[PDB]
Amino acid sequence: GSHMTYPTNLEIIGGQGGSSFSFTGENNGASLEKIWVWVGGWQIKAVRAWLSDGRDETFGVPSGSHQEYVFTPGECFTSLSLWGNGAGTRLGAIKFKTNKGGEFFAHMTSWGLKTEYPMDVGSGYCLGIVGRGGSDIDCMGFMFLNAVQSTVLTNVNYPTINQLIPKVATEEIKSVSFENKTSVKQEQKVETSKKVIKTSSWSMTKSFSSTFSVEVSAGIPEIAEVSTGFSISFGVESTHSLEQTDEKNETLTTTVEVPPKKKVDVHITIGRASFDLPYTGTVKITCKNGSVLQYETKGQYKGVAYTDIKVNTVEKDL
Amino acid sequence: GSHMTYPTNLEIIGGQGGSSFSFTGENNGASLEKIWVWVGGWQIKAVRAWLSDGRDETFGVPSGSHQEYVFTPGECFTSLSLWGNGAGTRLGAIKFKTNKGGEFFAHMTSWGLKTEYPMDVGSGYCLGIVGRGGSDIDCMGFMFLNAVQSTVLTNVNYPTINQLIPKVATEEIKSVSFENKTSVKQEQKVETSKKVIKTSSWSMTKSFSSTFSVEVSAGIPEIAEVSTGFSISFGVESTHSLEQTDEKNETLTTTVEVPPKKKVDVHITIGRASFDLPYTGTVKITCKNGSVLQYETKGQYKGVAYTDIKVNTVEKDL
Numbered sequence: 134g135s136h137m138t139y140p141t142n143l144e145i146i147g148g149q150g151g152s153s154f155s156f157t158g159e160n161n162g163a164s165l166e167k168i169w170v171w172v173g174g175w176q177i178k179a180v181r182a183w184l185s186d187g188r189d190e191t192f193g194v195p196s197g198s199h200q201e202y203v204f205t206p207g208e209c210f211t212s213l214s215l216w217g218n219g220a221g222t223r224l225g226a227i228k229f230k231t232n233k234g235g236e237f238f239a240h241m242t243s244w245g246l247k248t249e250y251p252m253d254v255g256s257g258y259c260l261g262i263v264g265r266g267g268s269d270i271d272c273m274g275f276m277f278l279n280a281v282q283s284t285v286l287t288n289v290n291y292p293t294i295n296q297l298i299p300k301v302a303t304e305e306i307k308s309v310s311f312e313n314k315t316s317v318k319q320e321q322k323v324e325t326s327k328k329v330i331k332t333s334s335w336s337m338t339k340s341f342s343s344t345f346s347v348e349v350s351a352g353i354p355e356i357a358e359v360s361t362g363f364s365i366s367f368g369v370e371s372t373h374s375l376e377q378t379d380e381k382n383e384t385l386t387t388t389v390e391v392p393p394k395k396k397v398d399v400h401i402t403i404g405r406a407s408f409d410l411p412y413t414g415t416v417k418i419t420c421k422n423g424s425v426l427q428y429e430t431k432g433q434y435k436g437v438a439y440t441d442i443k444v445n446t447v448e449k450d451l
Numbered sequence: 452g453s454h455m456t457y458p459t460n461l462e463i464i465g466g467q468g469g470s471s472f473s474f475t476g477e478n479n480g481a482s483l484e485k486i487w488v489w490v491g492g493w494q495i496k497a498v499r500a501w502l503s504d505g506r507d508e509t510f511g512v513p514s515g516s517h518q519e520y521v522f523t524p525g526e527c528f529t530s531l532s533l534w535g536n537g538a539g540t541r542l543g544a545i546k547f548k549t550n551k552g553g554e555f556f557a558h559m560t561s562w563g564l565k566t567e568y569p570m571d572v573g574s575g576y577c578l579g580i581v582g583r584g585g586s587d588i589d590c591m592g593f594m595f596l597n598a599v600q601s602t603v604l605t606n607v608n609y610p611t612i613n614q615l616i617p618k619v620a621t622e623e624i625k626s627v628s629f630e631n632k633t634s635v636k637q638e639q640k641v642e643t644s645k646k647v648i649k650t651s652s653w654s655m656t657k658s659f660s661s662t663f664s665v666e667v668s669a670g671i672p673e674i675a676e677v678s679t680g681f682s683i684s685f686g687v688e689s690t691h692s693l694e695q696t697d698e699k700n701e702t703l704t705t706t707v708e709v710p711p712k713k714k715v716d717v718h719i720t721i722g723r724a725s726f727d728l729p730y731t732g733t734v735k736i737t738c739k740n741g742s743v744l745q746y747e748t749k750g751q752y753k754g755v756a757y758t759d760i761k762v763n764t765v766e767k768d769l
């Protein structure tokens with residue numbers, strides 16, 4: 134009496150004839166983006182579906198006009214019912230509603246509807262359609278991702294990071310000169326403060342990111358100024374949000390020595406690095422029921438990072 | 452002995468004549484937003500200054516044309532020098548540069564410049580001007596906030612919060628129905644997941660928030676559904692950013708009882724509240740040197756908040 138759970142929820146309605154089809158984003162997390170439905174007197178006649186990855190297929194043989202539903206990013210099912218044709222030989226009707234308040238109802242036109250089969254839409258995120266068809270839709274179901282516990286982008290790599298040439302803009306913070314006209318040493322304390330706004334973002338298809346809160350477990354590109362010049366490093370792995378911004382007052386206290394009968398110019402700056410480079414990773418979806426769906430992904434990472442505050446001191450005679 | 456530090460940095464250059472003036476944001480964190488400078492042969496003739504709170508005053512008596520600098524929000528000084536008029540009786544010249552690459556130089560037109568006095572601009576955030584004036588600018592300095600360790604909005608209150616009538620939008624998550632044709636109750640499990648995006652923002656003058664990272668120590672308005680309806684509460688105090696957004700997968704697992712000979716409709720929803728209400732607080736600036744500047748402030752809070760997921764069931768015979 135062991136029990137198996139799955140990351141998808143699929144209930145197929147209709148008859149036993151025709152040829153099998155499966156048209157879903159189980160491979161890559163694509164969702165149903167658009168659907169056209171044709172009907173006949175005693176069946177759903179045909180269905181054409183588009184997934185968010187651009188796939189486009191037709192099942193059954195269209196006749197007459199079609200009805201359309203176009204899903205916008207983030208627009209999930211809230212409810213779905215299917216009917217057979219009452220004879221156990223075809224799909225008869227499709228009714229659904231969405232979280233944007235849309236409704237869609239397509240049905241056979243001669244025979245009345247009998248038993249309604251209301252479906253659990255899981256998370257509401259529809260991965261596509263599975264069934265059998267020939268001339269008509271013999272049977273079909275809508276496949277949903279089950280309710281999710283977590284959605285994580287992990288195993289993140291930046292394949293070009295070690296080829297990247299640092300682009301670092303100088304931001305001026307402050308400059309001041311000191312004078313020592315005596316023949317003794319002087320010291321001057323200089324304190325510095327500067328707001329820095331650090332950002333990270335990993336690109337993802339908007340339909341997926343609109344529906345799910347994606348946690349990122351990744352290192353990010355980092356910038357420092359070192360001996361020969363600027364250096365880019367692949368930082369240590371930590372938890373981020375998909376788009377993240379943090380701000381801080383970065384500060385420094387510097388003691389400048391002023392040697393006798395000399396002028397000392399103090400120049401205080403910081404470097405601002407932009408990052409714009411591709412990444413690879415794995416999307417791991419863990420469902421409430423304990424099952425997992427995962428797939429490889431790629432995108433673009435954009436980040437802003439700052440160096441440490443830098444103090445440059447130049448001596449003159451005077 | 453003891454050592455005294457101050458939250459402001461001000462070095463006044465010129466002579467001892469004229470009447471004292473003080474035109475600064477010490478009281479309220481206002482910054483120098485615009486300056487006009489008139490010159491004569493042996494003096495800075497007059498200065499008109501605008502602060503970011505709308506204050507506008509003129510010191511000295513204008514003659515001839517003026518030079519202008521207008522500071523955009525976040526544009527801080529990087530450097531400043533002042534000159535007397537050589538005789539030690541008037542201010543003679545003003546030179547500054549900004550973190551946006553601007554430079555301004557106004558000087559007396561006949562007598563030559565002598566000793567340059569380079570200034571420490573502290574944080575770079577200029578609170579205003581202080582000096583003495585009559586016909587001319589006898590002496591003047593630019594007042595700066597010293598380098599900052601932290602800037603915090605605290606003691607936050609929402610004075611209208613207990614008057615507010617909850618306005619809460621329903622977001623549909625999922626609905627499904629079950630039917631029980633038997634003489635014994637049945638149990639259906641339903642899992643729910645729903646992305647929510649929660650936000651907080653406390654308005655502040657853009658010159659200040661562009662220059663300083665303002666941490667917020669505050670409770671926020673919260674929304675909940677109670678037996679009697681929706682309820683707004685003043686949440687517990689915690690750390691926030693001045694503008695904050697967080698996303699989360701809200702989830703729930705529910706056992707639905709289907710009584711004998713009944714159909715049960717299950718409707719799962721969440722409530723979204725959009726707060727837009729005034730706040731009062733205290734801004735506390737702690738400088739690197741240990742001194743503090745604080746003042747009362749007021750503004751508008753905006754935030755999106757959600758209730759818990761709600762499950763509603765309705766029974767019908769059949």
Ligand SMILES: [Cl-]
Nearest residue numbers: 217219220221
């Ligand atoms: Cl049937």
Ligand SMILES: [Cl-]
Nearest residue numbers: 535536537539
């Ligand atoms: Cl002088």
